[PDB]
């Protein structure tokens, strides 16, 4: 399967630099050029540049040339983007995207890496269990995790190390006036399986290197 796997999201200070990776697999790396495209929140796509994976020569969007270095490691089929002298307006999701062989469209896109540029402190979330106190006999039951007070985005949530997927609903975060985010993830279960199996949410906040596993039901 053609895959383009990107490195994790990060918070950087203004003036610093970020280096994002894109590991390619499932095809011969030197058969396609690689491009980098970014998207600021709520905005459109902005092309940054394209690299020839055989020669390492690049074509840049002129606006980025002075502070963007695109390279490849042909020994690990990985493409890299290093953006320096970071500015607040560089906050965006950076995607690698494969260029069609002998063509000029982008046929496969990576999922993106969110880079936030800010002087604000990173803050890993506090995870609290969500359960009814005594809610009405019914075969449905809602259990959750409140991922509280984190910065920046993004956060990912899974349940029971990824085994639990059915009935899972992870909600988009609210941004509080304090500049911190919070989100919730809920699982709607069968009420009979409540005492039989444990339910644990797994929260990952890459910008702060925070990983939390929280037992909701035992």
């Amino acid at each position: 399967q053609v895959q383009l796997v990107q490195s994790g999201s990060e918070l950087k200070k203004p003036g610093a630099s970020v280096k994002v990776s894109c590991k390619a697999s499932g095809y011969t790396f030197t058969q396609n050029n690689m491009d980098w495209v970014r998207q600021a929140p709520g905005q459109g796509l902005e092309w940054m540049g394209d690299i020839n994976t055989r020669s390492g020569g690049v074509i840049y969007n002129e606006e980025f040339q002075d502070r963007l270095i695109m390279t490849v490691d042909k020994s690990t089929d990985t493409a890299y983007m290093e953006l320096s002298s970071l500015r607040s307006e560089d906050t965006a999701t950076y995607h690698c995207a494969r260029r069609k062989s002998y063509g000029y469209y982008l046929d496969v896109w990576g999922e993106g890496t969110l880079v936030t540029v800010s002087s604000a402190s990173t803050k890993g979330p506090s995870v609290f269990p969500l359960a009814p106190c005594s809610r009405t006999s019914e075969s449905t039951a809602a259990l959750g995790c409140l991922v509280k007070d984190y910065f920046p985005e993004p956060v990912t949530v899974s349940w029971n190390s990824g085994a639990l997927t059915s009935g899972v609903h992870t909600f988009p975060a609210v941004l509080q006036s304090s500049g911190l985010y919070s989100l919730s993830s809920v699982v709607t279960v069968p009420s009979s399986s409540l005492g039989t199996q444990t339910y644990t949410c797994n929260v990952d906040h890459k910008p702060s290197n925070t990983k939390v596993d929280k037992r909701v039901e035992s």
């Binding site: 491009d35 092309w47 995607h95 469209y105 982008l106 269990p129 959750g144």
Partner: protein, 212 residues
Amino acid sequence: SYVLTQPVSVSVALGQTATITCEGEQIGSKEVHWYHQRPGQAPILVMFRDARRPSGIPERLSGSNSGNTASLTISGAEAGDEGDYYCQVWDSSSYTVFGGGTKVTVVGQPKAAPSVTLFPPSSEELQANKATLVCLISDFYPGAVTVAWKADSSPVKAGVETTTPSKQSNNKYAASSYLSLTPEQWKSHRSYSCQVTHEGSTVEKTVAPTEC
């Protein structure tokens, strides 16, 4: 500096046809490619070289390009067609150029009533001298939803943070509302309620500190 111009937004109803334009000087002499970005996902290629579809794209999507206008037509519109569409060209001097995007909303869709869950503050949070009530609202359509909080029937006009509704992979919307209280405020009332109104129907969930 080659420029591509797209309309800001297009609405299309279920089963219907709509066209998104991509204007450029003499764009008919270039090859135009299109991408669809669904809410919270990465873009995907949906049309290349004006009118060719890549793997998995149904024939009800078509493309054309002539003169100064290229276009993408969505026919038989489905809920999954919602999202932002971008046109793109390669220019020998400007290199890769994208249009600004068109937001496509799929309308004429049927009503789905929301599922509402209200959670009280956890014991762990109360230990940390905080209390958040969490009201989760899922599987609704259309997006318009109003959320009101009450403390023993009286409206709460402090400590409420509600999320703007966002689309689920289900093509239905979700939203969250959070009420922040101190542990003393939480235990000072017999009940708290989250009231959600959707297309004229109101549903309510309640929590009681004495049940905790």
